[PDB]
Design a protein around this ligand. Sequence first.
Ligand SMILES: O=C(O)CNC(=O)C(=O)O
Ligand SMILES: [Mg+2]
Ligand code: NI
Ligand SMILES: [Zn+2]
Length: 331
Amino acid sequence: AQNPNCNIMIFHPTKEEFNDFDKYIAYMESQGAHRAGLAKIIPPKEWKARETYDNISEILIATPLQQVASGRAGVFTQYHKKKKAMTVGEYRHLANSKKYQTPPHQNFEDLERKYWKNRIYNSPIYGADISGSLFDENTKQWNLGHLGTIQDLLEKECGVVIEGVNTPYLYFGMWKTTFAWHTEDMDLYSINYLHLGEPKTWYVVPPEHGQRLERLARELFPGSSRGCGAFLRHKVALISPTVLKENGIPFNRITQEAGEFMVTFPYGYHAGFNHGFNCAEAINFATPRWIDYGKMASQCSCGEARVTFSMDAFVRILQPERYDLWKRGQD
Ligand SMILES: O=C(O)CNC(=O)C(=O)O
Ligand SMILES: [Mg+2]
Ligand code: NI
Ligand SMILES: [Zn+2]
């Protein structure tokens, strides 16, 4: 069995190997990458996502989210308070302001310590989930707006044609902006490219151990757990590495820098934080190996998780028994 300790693997494809996305994902899995839940891909030196980032300031962040925490330093939830619209240029200035800027630090480890110590005492503002792309249309390799669609994958694997579309999302972050513990909708893959700026630290639980994280989360968030049998789908709960280690939960951590891709694998729980002003782009995708995960994915039916139009068909076709209850949650 490849990668039996479920370590995060890092890949350095050549320009020739960067041509065929599906084939490279399958190669990474042949080496056991999926066992970690997360892999890093460093593009060949010949590649670029676009020529410059000098002309992005007029992109609008229509609903910036202020991430307000409740709980204790290592075990907290966050809620998202909607703020007034601002441009990316306005947001970058805000991120660099004395109130919100990254503190002085020695190295990534020192900054990670400061994050876990102090996150709950601040409420950083995240420009998340903005439909759009920063890949140049002429970038032919690993262009996240030109991937094969999940609807086409389901059709190719299972023969059923379904409605829905699959497009990327931009994330503009600042120091302490936070992504809560989650897997993807329908336990899909994700791919995330850090276009610019400061790093993003990731934590991940191997898929084979995801239920260990769920059991801890039910212990640590007991009212949430009573409210919903899949409350990590709400994407609001954080648990620190110190707390995970105290409870024996297997996990790994890695820092993504600008110019690097991360891939999350089906049912790989992940969480993390941004080091300072940055911009990432991400999209979900599928492979043949995903289908069995999609069929088994938990679902939130309490009404909190509210998701895209396109998840309807996935539930309807892969999870027909759950469909009626899940759709009630959506309406
Ligand atoms: O970058 C972020 O805030 C969150 N991204 C992801 O969870 C992802 O790409 O799967
Ligand atoms: Mg612009
Ligand atoms: Ni994710
Ligand atoms: Zn729920």
